[PDB]
């Protein structure tokens, strides 16, 4: 009658899809998350689909020393 998964795994999956569809495909849908995490980013790099750089969320302070600028000083006012 009802199959046992560890005896015949493929037969069980066939029965589960037809007999407990909501629970079976819920397990399938949940497993597609990790599967797409392992497959799509690798393939995107192959096809050139490059990730966008992060947008600034703070003022972008330049590294290194200050530039020693001259201009728009107080003598330039008025």
């Amino acid at each position: 009658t009802t199959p046992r998964f560890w005896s015949t795994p493929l037969k069980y999956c066939r029965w589960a899809a037809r007999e407990r569809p909501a629970l079976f495909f819920s397990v399938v849908i949940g497993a597609l998350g990790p599967v797409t995490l392992a497959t799509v980013p690798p393939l995107r790099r192959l096809i050139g689909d490059v990730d966008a750089a992060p947008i600034p969320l703070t003022y972008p302070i330049p590294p290194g020393p200050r530039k020693q600028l001259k201009g728009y000083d107080d003598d330039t006012e008025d």
Partner: protein, 167 residues
Amino acid sequence: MATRKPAFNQHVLLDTTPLPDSIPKVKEIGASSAPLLSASFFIGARCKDYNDDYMQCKNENPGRGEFECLKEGRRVTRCARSVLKDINTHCLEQFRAHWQCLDNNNQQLWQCRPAEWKLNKCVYENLKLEKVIPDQPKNSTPVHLRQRQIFAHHAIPPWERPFIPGQ
């Protein structure tokens, strides 16, 4: 006056005391949010170095950046003031069209591309300033140079064209 967001304020406190004469006087910027948003990338073009210098000065002086960076603070004001005089001398019509469009469009830049393309062409051929957005995805067209804006309430006229500098 702390940076905490107020929730029960009912009054405003103003102080009339001026700065001491020991501090050089700078005239403040008289432009409101919409015009200086439409001038922001042109300010960012001419005044990048002074903008960065003023923020580097403050990072060099933690807890004291206000008082120890006033002169570099004054230089930022005068450089941005120079762009706003320059635009108001050469591109006043296109300037006004863009920020009046912005001021009617929740100050969202993708709702005013035709006016922005008009002004970007005028600013480039008068003041030689280029709008630049760092680190845009190289595979795609830059978003501000796209013919169609997916999020624009008004679809964009096919005839209105993005201004690519040097085309």
